[model samples]
Target: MLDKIVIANRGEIALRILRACKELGIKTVAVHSSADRDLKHVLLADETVCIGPAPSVKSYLNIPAIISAAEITGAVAIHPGYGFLSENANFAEQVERSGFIFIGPKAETIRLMGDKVSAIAAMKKAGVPCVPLENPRHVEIQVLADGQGNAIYLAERDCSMQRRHQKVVEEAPAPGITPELRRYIGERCAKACVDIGYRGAGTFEFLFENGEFYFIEMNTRIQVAHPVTEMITGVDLIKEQLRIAAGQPLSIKQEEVHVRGHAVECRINAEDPNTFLPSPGKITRFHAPGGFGVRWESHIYAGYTVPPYYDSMIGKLICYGENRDVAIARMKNALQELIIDGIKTNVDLQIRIMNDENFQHGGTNIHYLEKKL
Candidate 1:
């Protein structure tokens, strides 16, 4: 357990890390923008420091200021919640060189997976079936045109079946994600960390479409989609991350991490459900869903102001069932039970998406939401 930890961002993720640190009996330092001085996260932290101004480029993304804050506060580790410098290799190196733990993967690990082409090559070598494509950056292109001169749908995503990129509603193994393929991918994922000496929790996000997966990018920290993986694996990723930092060996090996059934996580953001945009305000009305395999993680009270300065997500609703259909039903019920007033939210939009025809059939198109909404 770290004696002191510094959170290098703002809003709910900052608050979330502070809470996690609290549970682990660690003191927390919050680095925030000047505009967020009076926010909930600042007040909750043991100590708070202003990194920069309202703009993220000068404020949250200011690595020097963030590192300086950690150094000044005597923090032993820096926990980058999600965005910002979380996955930046240079930032990770800075954390270590400045005598503090980055609390994520090693820098070289970040470098290896940061480049998509190299990552795909590595995956293929590891027996992971990736979508067949010319490395866009390498190959000289001539779109093989038909006699009619129409371009092919060279790019794809089964995401349109269950999610619209970030706003995924329902998800199941695509028609192409065969059992053997998943096993091989999982093996490669575990080996990936060992290969780069990544010491903490990380996520390898792959874009799937038309029976192929493309290496998108890697998240070298905790994810909002964590709970979905948890429902299927019964592993507490956050706790595992803590253990990793504490010098414990990987408890669950690649062979042991069995993925089963179907799980879904629908984000409950403060925005218009129809337009799917940010809607920040006070929550005058609220009620979470109930029943088995339904878990909601949020920190909002009736008077709690939903700040427009951060991610619109107020919480996440994660559901696990025997199959994809069961999970979808549970998610639908969970959304129906949620109620909030004072400002709009994307809940209604998520519900509509959940009920959409394209979503039900496990549609593999990533442009599902764009076409629907």
Candidate 2:
């Protein structure tokens, strides 16, 4: 087990990793920038370190500062929760070379997967399909691997509803994918993991069109949409990443993994619904949706200010049900229930998409959101 781990990011993902560490009886060190001193995870962490000022370059992206934080806190590993330094090969290399485990893939694997040309070649060599290549669907498979060469794919997420290539809404067990297609794609991705000697949590993005799948790129770190995959597969990806970095084999086998029900996630961004511009300010009144199968992953509260120095996404509202229809209905209800005052969020836009005819039908392509607007 990892005795102590440093969370090298901010916002909901940092809090997400901290919660997972606590559940595994591992101590957490939350490293933050001066602008993020009051972040939820920082306050809840066993130890907190301010890496630098507001800017990412001198703070979250500062390799030396992050390493020093880990060293001072005596953390055995560092979990770069999505974005920032999560996929930086140099950072991963520095973390391991500095005598601390990087709770993700090896630096070489990250380098290999970070390059589009090399990643496609590697996937093709591993027998994974690639795009021969829009109005194309953006789907991705979530896979977890360990140093022991054991790997398994949790399933697929439909992140087709995107704006400016950013996923605004996501769902598990993509609406139209059949059982056979899911197995075929998933198995190929798992084989690719073993072929590339990848360890920790990763994702294989693909573009599906005309009933065929085409490879995009692989994300060598845990993703923001991971919760939907976890909701369906009952796997804690962060804990798995920790165990893998500790030299443990994958806790679950491929045959043992099964997808249950359906799950949908809406990214609640602090942006204008109409203008799609960042709306950062203090949240005066906050209310989160709850009930059966409703999961709210956020670091914001009524008085917490949404800092303009970072991503606009303030929270993730995920809902699960026995099927897709029920899941969508639940999401609609949850969107209506959630309220964040003093900030212009895209909640109204999310609610509109939830009730739209095209989104209701599913399999909407990447251009759907823009077209709707």
Candidate 3:
């Protein structure tokens, strides 16, 4: 177990890590921007240090200042709690070179997997089945100086089925995969990380289309879509992360990670639907969903003031079941139990998205949500 760790981000996630530290009996320090001087994580940490102003450039994303804070506090490691510099390989390298542990993958792993293009080659080498696509969004910018770019983008996610990138209504097994492709791809993703020698929570993203899987950027940090994988395999991802980081090989071998059923995650953001603008106020009421494999991960409490200075995410409402239909029902039932006051949220938008026919049938693209709106 880590003796001491520094949280380098803010909001609900920061608090989440802090609680985990408490359970693990690890000392924690929270770094905050001037604008977030009174945030919950800052107030709740074993100790809180002010880094800079609220604007990320000067605060959370400021690697040097964060490093300084960590050194001054004698932290053994730094846990970048989502966003900010979580997936920045350069930042990870700097953190480790400064003589402190970066509580994620090795820097080399981050570099290879953080970018989509590099990850594709690495995954293929590791034997993961990657969907081939003619268009990938990530490319060598200088190579395309002539404007006739040769870039390839992965297939689109009919995320039109949900709100935010948190997976409002994700179709299980994704779309367009043969048995061989599915097994091959999952193995490739896992082996690529092993080959790169990265040990931590990471996700190999993909865009799917017409029985094909296209590679997307690799998220070196833990992902919001983890529940989908967990739903099928009965793995406790949070615990899995801890085990992997602590030097345990994955308990389930490549063959053991069987994919089954459909799962969906709905992000409950403290924002408005139509305008798509943030609406930070107070959570006058709060209730969690129940029954079956429903999971609600959040740090919000009734009367807690939603901070305007942080990311729009208030919490995650995830659902899992024997199939897509059961998952959807569990999600709707769980959401029905949820109601917050004094702040406008996109709950209705999420409901509408879940009820979408294309989403039910998995006939959508990445721009599905944007186009639907």
C-alpha local distance difference test of each model = 0.66, 0.93, 0.66
- As a whole number from 0 to 100, the lDDT of residue 215 in candidate 2 is 95
Candidate 2 per-residue lDDT over residues 1-373, each given as its tens digit: 8999999999999999999899989999999998998899999999999999999999999999999999988899999989999999999999999999999999999999999999999998999999763468998999999967888999999999988989999999898899899999999999999999999999999999888889999999999999999999889888888889888888798888999999999999999877899999999999999989999999999899988899899999999999999899999999999989999999998999999998888999989898988
- Candidate 2 wrong stretches, greater than 4 Å: none
Worst lDDT run of 10 residues, candidate 3, spans 139-148
Query: On a 0 to 100 scale, what is the lDDT of residue 32 in model 2?
Result: 91
lDDT of 2 at 295: 98
Error of 1 at 234 (Å): 1.6
Among all windows of 10 consecutive residues in model 1, the one with the lowest summed lDDT is 137-146
Off by over 4 Å in 1: 37-43, 117-165, 170-178, 209-212, 273-277
Where does candidate 2 clash, by residue pair?
none
Which is better, 1 or 2, measured by TM-score?
2
Give per-model TM-scores. Answer: 0.81, 0.99, 0.81
The candidates, ranked best first by lDDT, are 2, 3, 1
